[PDB]
Amino acid sequence: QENHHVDYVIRFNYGDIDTPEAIKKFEVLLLELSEVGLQTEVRQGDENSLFVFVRAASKKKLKRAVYQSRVRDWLYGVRNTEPEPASSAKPQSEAERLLVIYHLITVPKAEGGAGITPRHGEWKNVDAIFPLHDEETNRQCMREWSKKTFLSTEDLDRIRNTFGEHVGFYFAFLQSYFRFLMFPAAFGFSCWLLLGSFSIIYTVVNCLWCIVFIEYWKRQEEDLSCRWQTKGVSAVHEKRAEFKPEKEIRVRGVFPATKRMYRQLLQVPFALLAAVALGAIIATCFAIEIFISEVYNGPLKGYLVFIPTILVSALIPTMSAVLLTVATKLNDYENYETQDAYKVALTQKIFVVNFITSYLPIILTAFVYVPFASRIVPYLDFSINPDRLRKQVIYFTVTAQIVGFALETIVPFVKEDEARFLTRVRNEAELEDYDVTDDLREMCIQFGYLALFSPVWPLVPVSFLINNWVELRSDFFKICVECKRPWPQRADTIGPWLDSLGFLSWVGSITSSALVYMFSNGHEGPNGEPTTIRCWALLLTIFFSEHLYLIVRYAVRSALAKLEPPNTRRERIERFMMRKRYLDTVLSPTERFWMRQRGWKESAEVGLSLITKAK
Amino acid sequence: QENHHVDYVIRFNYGDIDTPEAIKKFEVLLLELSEVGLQTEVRQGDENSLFVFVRAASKKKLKRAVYQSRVRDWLYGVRNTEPEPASSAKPQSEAERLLVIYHLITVPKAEGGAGITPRHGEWKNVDAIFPLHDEETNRQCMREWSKKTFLSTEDLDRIRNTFGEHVGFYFAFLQSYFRFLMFPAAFGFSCWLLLGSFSIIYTVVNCLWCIVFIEYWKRQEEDLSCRWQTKGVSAVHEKRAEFKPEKEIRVRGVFPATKRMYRQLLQVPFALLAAVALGAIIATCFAIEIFISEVYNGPLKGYLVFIPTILVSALIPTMSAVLLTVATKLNDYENYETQDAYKVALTQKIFVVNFITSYLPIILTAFVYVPFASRIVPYLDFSINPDRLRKQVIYFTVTAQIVGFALETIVPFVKEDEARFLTRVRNEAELEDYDVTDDLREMCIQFGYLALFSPVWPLVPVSFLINNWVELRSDFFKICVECKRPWPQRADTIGPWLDSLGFLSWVGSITSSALVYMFSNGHEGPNGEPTTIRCWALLLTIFFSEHLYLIVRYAVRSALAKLEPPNTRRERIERFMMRKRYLDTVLSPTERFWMRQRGWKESAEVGLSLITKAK
């Protein structure tokens, strides 16, 4: 078997604990797991850690726990089909058994399982709860679709039966994104060949392609959550231990939704602190690099040009670690009963930083360096470089996808009987804690380049087509080789990223039509002076293109709503048929006016006597 | 009783039928009703009509039909609480008994009831199926809230238990609209007093008030449909007899959703035909009335000025009857399985005509007469009247609400034992066929004036506050006195009008900020020459105000989504508790690794031997 029927490993730390308090908490850790029906085996983890191997103590106690989990989904409307009895309740997959065991270890004792919250409040010494990789399943899948162009629907199901729906939704989204990139890649190679850059025809097909892909994925997510049975999964979301209720009414532990809305008002100050903090470092290091590159005409230019590129690589990550610390403090200040609401809210605070770090460099070039900078450089102490804007779009969409592939997958990888097994469990325990949000962020940031700036150099979607094929293979390699196996968390969507994709598509119709206008003479546009830009005509072309985007997006969203995908229709029918079974099994004076014409024949003849008489 | 226990009257016509074919169809009309469990009494209707009085033939056959109706709602997810057994199934109200009887008369014989479709395909002679007014309930309600400022929640429930949810939703919306108009009415009287017109402070509070009201009503509709148990009522919508299936699979009679989408493409040609047809008549009759009012300096001016006002009152209604005939032909061309989808689609085709007839006159004044018309009048063969734009907003928001009240309610009203009862049934049968869409249209068109043009003369929301109090009383009077009683149709929303209210609020943030800019010098603005309008600054003030509207609307819509109204929470809890009852009533080698430490105590001591040894 090579995994020894081990479900999870719980790593217990004692490096910061004295022996009387260490073994005091190790006892409760073991009897909490024993009480909820799990079997344990203790071994040496590290020089300072002692991890515990956990397994379902019996097929009867696991079938009952699997049954109780399906009953909880059905009661809350996630499943919609009756859960078949506990006598035949085998896990549908490995991801279902691993999710049922994970909930026994972590949900609080009033909810059914041991309340082992790793490292929060009483299990601070508990550092990790991780499952073990199925190495041969991981290696057969890796070689099997390094020879294909697309992963089958069954290949995508194999990813969720191993890693769960949250990881499976990312790969389903990335595959659908890659399949849609074939159109602008083929169209973007035509327009780059026949036409040039800043083409009117390219910019319209590109904005129309971004509308169709986002609307197609919003509908494909609903179909996919109905197929995987995670459709309303937010109703059974796991509470987070750090929550602080105000009252406690049954018991639930309520915190008012309006009180949290006042604290959420602080995100407006935070979003402006980040744009003043990051924007000042990006704009200042851009103005420097314009000076020593096009203004400073002295010696030392060979080895003085790397200053700005270096000074931003040591200042943007430093400031982003500061803003991520402020965002986490503000996220904690809001209370967030659930772990998903906490994670969704934190990802949304960080998107403000990602939008500025990722796109502000190109926005300064296209909209403050090209139109201006014959006005600026007299104060910066002109003949702007007409290829600065194109060489920067190439760097972010080609050299950043190639360089980023190296730091993402290669550098992390380069940095008696039970002795071989225990040796590799100690190796798995020192790998990384995979986060599918990091992958989703990188794909949605990449979508923003296509949406915002692809008219500059329409070969961008060819770079993304080639990159995204490799990305799907190397992201799967990264999960199987360089990260601990993620516990099979569920999801019905890629989350807050679907609204960022639509925000970037909207913003892209404004910046794309501003670029098609101010470069309609060439790629040099207004060579540094803003005189030849009719500000009214720049604004008219943005007003019409933005409202043509909004109108076409409403038409495309309303068409697709009329086309119910099949898995979504089957859950609507199945909710009807469930209620039919419940209904079949259980539930099984004036009157003188009406005494006139007794039957329907007398009415019939009273009508004949009047119909004929009236003619 | 005074209504003689009569549920419906079916008016049978024979003025265009010979006796052998008339009585041939009167027989089937009577035995179709007899078979579905109704009792009939025939009397003379008119000189050419013979209407049939219908009643539930027994309390056992009505309790069973009421029970089968509640079972159909529960099976399709409209109800969410189990339907209590047929033995105790009494109608909750008069509107529930009248709706259960109406479905017996009209739904097709394969669905349960007689297939009496008035005047469509075989019941062409059947001209009307109407219930009888409960005159004393109608008169007690009318006097009871002509003495109040607001109707209670119980008064609004009394309107739906009599007239159904579709009429009840209009009165609930009109009351909520009137209660919200107190703010801009009080604020609009402040700004008109202290400030003047075209105030920056008035225009921002007005656009912010339109956001809050629309978002508040979208949430109040969901709460109200959960309270009235019509939440997902579109799943049990009545099919329309005129539908034409392509296939027929079980049997359902399908027509492809994509085939209908191609025919719906013709609404783009229709919407442009109407804007070229109506716009040319409005713009031409406006240019005339500018000529003979400010340009023509000859005699006959006293009795030549009424030409344009007369020529548009005889041309706009004539053209609108033509476009309503084209819209109905295009609506029929699309197939529309349901009667609601047919009605919703027709209301949306007519909103294009309503938007142009209602607002284009003022839009021509504010945006082609004030900025231009010192350039136009040299070609029209200048010193524009600086009060033309204000006197026209006053006419549409004061004189049109007073004049319209007269044509709506006053002019339509001014234009042995069973002999007194039959005399008033013949009077009820000649009244009008009330349409709640006509009322909803008038309230949403009125909202558009507030949204679009109220900065001109901020006393507009005071006119609408006073008007809407009266409107609620006179619209109820009109239904009870001047129209046949509507059968108690159900609804979970005011329909397509909620998206027009949001479209008008969006457009109003563009025209309001354009008016605040070009009249920031006074109410005379640019006196006929467009020279002093900086076109870039007109466009910058529209770009920022429109995107501040969209941002504040997203923030307000996302806050309100976090605040689940109570009736909406009670249906979510009740779906859980229903499934709990269904679940309670029905549904009831490597192993050497784990043989090491049997209990949890042995693991506990193996951990002590390692914890101490490692320190």
Ligand SMILES: [Ca+2]
């Ligand atoms: Ca990558």
Ligand SMILES: [Ca+2]
């Ligand atoms: Ca990745």
Ligand SMILES: [Ca+2]
């Ligand atoms: Ca009226």
Ligand SMILES: [Ca+2]
């Ligand atoms: Ca009315």
